[model samples]
Target: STGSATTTPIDSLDDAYITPVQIGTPAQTLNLDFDTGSSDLWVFSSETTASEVDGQTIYTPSKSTTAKLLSGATWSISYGDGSSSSGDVYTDTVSVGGLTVTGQAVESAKKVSSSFTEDSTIDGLLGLAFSTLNTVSPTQQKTFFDNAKASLDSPVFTADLGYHAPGTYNFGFIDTTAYTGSITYTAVSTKQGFWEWTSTGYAVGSGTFKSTSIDGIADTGTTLLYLPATVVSAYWAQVSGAKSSSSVGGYVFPCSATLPSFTFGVGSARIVIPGDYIDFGPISTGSSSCFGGIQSSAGIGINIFGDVALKAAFVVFNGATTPTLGFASK
Candidate 1:
């Protein structure tokens, strides 16, 4: 279980996080998006239509002697952006960092949506969510972590994310130096197959510490921090001339505005996000209208504590039968 992998940001805005995964007998390395929000470890592969393939790397199962077709197994998943992927399944030896798992299920994509083909930087997605959420048919499969949990020092993994910089993911152990203050443990609701937990409350800049319970998923795969409508509005209200723009479809403000920091609690833990973090990025290339990273989760059903929030803290994902979550400051 002593496995550690370095994750790199796909762009300056941290659009996505990619980690190198060694798969098959000859160890073909492919960069995969480690999404805690999804449960299908699907990738572009030789089976994909050549006309649909872009610059992204594809997994050639035929090249790996250890790779075995799962016969009737198949999977498909859709993203909120209208992107989708479907594929046949294979079982092969997969390794992440120093951790190795034999007979790991790997879905080889036969088709992908335009958005995926457009993003040449992302070869595929490696789901970190619960196995229950896997979309495979005939026979569902365990996640890489779930399969490797028994072999790890402890059935736990920690996420140390960064902004505009690379971060590290650790399995089976926590790197104490990566975070400050004592780790605050909280009960996780795996009923949703997500790393969902309760946030004690929130505060805007130097304002009051509101005491309330906000349920949200600790999703590393998502890029923004979407909270309750009221909470998101409160933070934007503090910004000068900030407004929800129908043009851009989210909250936006002048780039020159002096924004305030956002903070959320995890039991006794307090993680703070710098004002710069919530800035997201300019709506357009050089436009003065800046998009807000903290948005309303009105239609989302559940709040999503995405990378914007994860970047502010070190998170622990427990893979025990009775799962839990932990947070600490950096």
Candidate 2:
């Protein structure tokens, strides 16, 4: 079966993209971050501590007739930034767009970090990466995409992220009209449980394309683009006042500084990220110090082609045995 859904950004910076999901009987609709970076379908729930509940819409699994506690299952996940959440699991009927999956493991949060409470935009997260990364113990659960792919007409999903507009996420089939130019395909590695691929090379604006392969992941949950320090520095060097600041913890430049576009090679094709998209807003409210959308991922151990780059092209995550990633300009 084929299906489609809409994913909208929480802000102009495209901090995170959230898609509506239906969980349970009468359908408790929640705006979930469809993250390809991690594998855990978790949510804020009635079981969550009242102190952790902010403006988020909590999922009430008890009210759903289809909800059943996964007796011995529990999950906990922590990010590099120290944000964490943990809780027990429940199997329920989860639906996204026109796609439905029964017995989908839904982790109900009992405790959440303060950062989640402050960022009220997303109610939960729907993982689209490989199921090997799922955090549930005893009986690891499959991702929403993993479970749904069995019934899909073609075991694939596509992401057409737009700039300051509604993005589209399709299941089973690709929307050919949504993109322009020819699609370029690359083999994806699941060893890391991410939609990881390698770029053929990169170019900074009009600079000559450096034919150097750079491995990275297509992470929808992350907001900015991250590459090797050499590439990041080369791009920043072109900006008038851009500098890697210690206090700010990243590359920042004058708000009005002219920025150059960034391009990356996939096979023989290239995708260009506009300069305005690289301006990831100011370090503080209306501050002159603007944080760059692209940063060095050397500290992260791997490059991340986050939303800043994903939004520039139509991306397909093929779910075959040997998964592959496809990119096309839109």
Candidate 3:
């Protein structure tokens, strides 16, 4: 059987996308961020401290007859951005779109970092990476996708991330109608529990395409495109007034600057990110300074093709043997 789900954009923040997922018996629907960067299905729950909960909805295990505690098992995760969450584990039926996976490990959060606690809109995260990244202690857990793969017609999913608009996430099937032109395929190496792949090279605007190899992960949860510092520097140098600012923590430039487009290669495919999209809007409303969407992946060992990069194309996250990535113009 195949399943599909629609994703909604968060207000004007453009930081992440959310999808409704039902958990436990009687189905408690929660808006979860489908994160391909990590593997762990966690949610704000009754276990969390009231003060830390804020306006977020909580999943109450006690209210669901199907909820069962996995004795002595726990999970904790810390993201690169300093965001973290720790929780106890429960086995329950979890559903996304029309697909349901029984006995799925549901991490019920008892503690969350300030980044998550403050963001009330994101109740939890639905991890799409390999099950190897699951943080459950005593025994690592399988992601919902992993558990449902056997029943799926194909071990695949597609991410259609739109710019400030609603998109869709398809499971076990790809909608050719969602994208334009042909889907260009690339082999994915999941050595680090991510959809990691290498891009052939990159170019600024319509200039020459250099033959440099960049290894990075396709991360839907991340907001911006992050490449190596030297690469980032080269791209921004073309913009007359662009400069890396400590205050902005990235490359910033005049809001009126005519920024050049950025392009990255996936095999022979050249994905072009428009100049206006590179501006990433302003640092703040009425502020003359604006942040560049493409930034340096300095401390990060692996570069990231975040939302800013993915939104320009249709992406296929193939989970079949020897995971592959297929991209096409949108």
Candidate 4:
């Protein structure tokens, strides 16, 4: 479920689940895409020319032997579905799951388009989301955790993602096993690495969402989880024949009914998203199901919540580690 390439590991045909880290050097194992929306760690070199790109997984800094290519810098990335990529800079000595972090920082696109590479076979993108959305700092600049935050062996790096389906992209590290209570915290807000929350309302079935009120920002580089519109129209008034689909206006619901169990009120820190991710992965292709990750950028005032609401929680991300927002699970 995760493999776009720092080098090897690409399994998620839907068995959906991944967290295999190992990047370069005497270590070549890539299975990235542990994204929380946007941080950066691109892989796909071989000077990429195979028509720009597509579902990448193409390393080949001449088959590693210590890959390095910073002499000529250039790297680009853009996605919100709009899609885009341009590459150049490469630096190696990487490895994940086996730790090892030296140098590292990859991205070799030379211009891509197949919607930036069609979907599968990834050889890059292990952005554990946050670094103020690093696309590798304004080009060859350097920012994926401000240059591997002193070589990542833990200073902060946790996503522990899980979902084993819908293009699975897992990655683990933080999972305090549903936390045994009393850890309450909230501080990271220099602005860019974005992770500020406050909602305490939206848990449908097992009851308790504090009656809907909300606030948001769990933006893992944003893929879809936006909320508010009276909490997605009061969560489609608790399913039961649901109804919010002006042709994908932001609540599609209807993959055959049955939905509830929302829980996402980060204020008092409440997180839960069962009910098969709201009845079959966000549901509603139409016909009154009315809720599929609750889309609609609206005024873009805030409310991101993507990555399937962060694979349902347990996402401690504070790159320089003690900088802030650690403890995640539940």
- Please give each candidate's TM-score: 0.98, 0.98, 0.97, 0.33
Candidate topping lDDT: 2
lDDT of 3 at 284: 86
lDDT per residue as tens, model 4, 126-210: 5655555655534434434455555444555554345543322212233345344533455555465556645556665676556
Query: Model 2: how far is 153 from its true place, Å?
Result: 0.7
In candidate 2, list every pair of residues with a backbone clash.
Answer: none
Q: What is the lDDT of residue 85 in candidate 3?
A: 95
* Model 2: lowest-lDDT 10 consecutive positions: 76-85
lDDT of 1 at 182: 88
Error of 3 at 211 (Å): 1.8
Question: Candidate 3: which stretches are off by over 4 Å?
Answer: none
Candidate 2 backbone overlaps, count: 0
- The superposed Cα distance between candidate 2 and the true structure at residue 251, in angstroms, equals 0.4
What global local distance difference test value does model 4 have? 0.55
- Shift in Å, residue 207, candidate 4: 7.5
lDDT by residue (tens digit), candidate 3, 1-330:
788888988767478899999998899999999999999999999999787898898999999999999999999999877899998999999989889999999999999999998898999999998989999998999998899988988889899988878888888888989998888999889889999999999999978999899999999989899999988999988988899999878899888899888999989988888887676778988899888999999987779999889988899999888899998988
What is the number of backbone collisions in each predicted candidate, taken in the order shown? 1, 0, 0, 49
lDDT of each: 0.91, 0.92, 0.90, 0.55
